[PDB]
């Protein structure tokens, strides 16, 4: 045991406000910028919301992504590398639909040097990345009423699978009343769960596929 028993990156002012994706399946775009927003804060001291809409409109078919019909955080990061930047959310706000690409380099608020993917199903490796690097973009299996209806406590769904279909951000981990959890930031607004967060069962056999496809970006000096 060489890691903290608990982490929460919100407490270092590294997490932006919970967003609301609505009826556009842009959880992957929110997951991606969430993670890159923390690296930018660590780097620059400034906490700035980055443009998930930029990803939806611009990180498209060349990156295997389909906008509001889904995509991946790893290739969202590759776009941001290839494009040599991403706009701030305030210059390029979220509309919850597919649009023409309107990136403007004058409004670039972050960059990406590289990203790292973690091995599938490894909750000890995920825990290390979150303690030592920052918030980690993950997929979860969110296709269950109990997920949609989640209010509080440590989520555990018996019929949850490791096949992921929903992009979220791991911003911490800990133990609440006997139950180890990952602290997860969703993009369903503030009225979902614990002011927009869900604590999901940890060290429970890759529960809901939380450790199936982690990745995190880096901004180097």
Ligand X SMILES: O=C(CO)N1CCc2c(c(-c3ccc(Cl)c(C#Cc4ccc(Cl)cc4)c3)nn2CCCN2CCOCC2)C1
Coil, strand or helix at 122: coil
Instruction: Give the footprint of ligand X on residues 68-97 (CB under 6 A).
Output: 69-70, 72, 75
Q: Is 165 in the site for ligand X (CB under 6 A)?
A: yes
Output the smallest distance, CB 174 to ligand X, in A. 23
Q: Is 64 in the site for ligand X (CB under 6 A)?
A: yes
Closer CB to ligand X, 25 or 196, in the complex: 25
Which segment (2-10, 51-59, 164-172, 178-186) binds ligand X by CB under 6 A?
Answer: 164-172
Instruction: Give the footprint of ligand X on residues 90-149 (CB under 6 A).
Output: 139
Number of residues in contact with ligand X under rule CB under 6 A: 18
Output the smallest distance, CB 59 to ligand X, in A. 11
117-121 long-range Cβ contacts below 8 angstroms, 24+ apart: 117/74, 117/213, 117/214, 117/215, 118/211, 118/213, 118/214, 118/215, 120/206, 120/211, 120/212, 120/213, 121/162, 121/206, 121/211, 121/212
Torsion region of 208: left, alpha or beta (phi above 0 gives left; psi -120 to 50 gives alpha): left
Q: Is 25 in the site for ligand X (CB under 6 A)?
A: yes
Out of 21, 39, 162, 187, which residue is the one contacting ligand X (CB under 6 A)? 162
Q: Is 164 in the site for ligand X (CB under 6 A)?
A: yes
Q: For residue 55, give the nearest of 15, 17, 16, 102 by alpha carbon.
A: 102
45: CB partners within 8 A, 6+ apart: none
Q: Is 206 in the site for ligand X (CB under 6 A)?
A: no
Rounded to the nearest angstrom, the gap between the alpha carbon of residue 30 and the centroid of all alpha carbons in its chain is: 6
Out of 113, 152, 163, 191, which residue is the one contacting ligand X (CB under 6 A)? 163
Rounded to 5°, the CA angle 185-216-120 comes to 90
Closer CB to ligand X, 27 or 108, in the complex: 27
Which residues are near ligand X by CB under 6 A? Answer: 25, 27-28, 31, 64, 69-70, 72, 75, 139, 162-167, 212-213
């Amino acid at each position: 045991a060489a890691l903290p028993d608990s982490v929460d990156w919100r407490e270092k002012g590294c997490v932006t406000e919970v967003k609301y994706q609505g009826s556009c399946g842009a959880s992957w775009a929110f997951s991606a910028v969430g993670a890159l927003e923390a690296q930018l804060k660590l780097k620059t001291g400034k906490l700035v919301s980055l443009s998930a809409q930029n990803l939806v409109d611009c990180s498209t078919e060349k990156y295997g992504n389909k906008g509001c019909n889904g995509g991946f955080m790893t290739t969202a990061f590759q776009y941001i590398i290839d494009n040599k930047g991403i706009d701030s959310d305030a210059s390029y706000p979220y509309k919850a639909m597919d649009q023409k690409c309107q990136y403007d380099s004058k409004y670039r608020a972050a960059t990406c040097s590289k990203y790292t993917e973690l091995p599938y199903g490894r909750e000890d490796v995920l825990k290390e990345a979150v303690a030592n690097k920052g918030p980690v973009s993950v997929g979860v299996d969110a296709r269950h009423p109990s997920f949609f209806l989640y209010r509080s406590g440590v989520y555990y769904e018996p019929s949850c699978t490791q096949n992921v279909n929903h992009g979220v951000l791991v911003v911490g981990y800990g133990d609440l009343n006997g139950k180890e959890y990952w602290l997860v930031k969703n993009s369903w607004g503030h009225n979902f769960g614990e002011e927009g967060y869900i604590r999901m069962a940890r060290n429970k056999g890759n529960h809901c596929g939380i450790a199936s496809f982690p990745s995190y970006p880096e901004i180097l000096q």
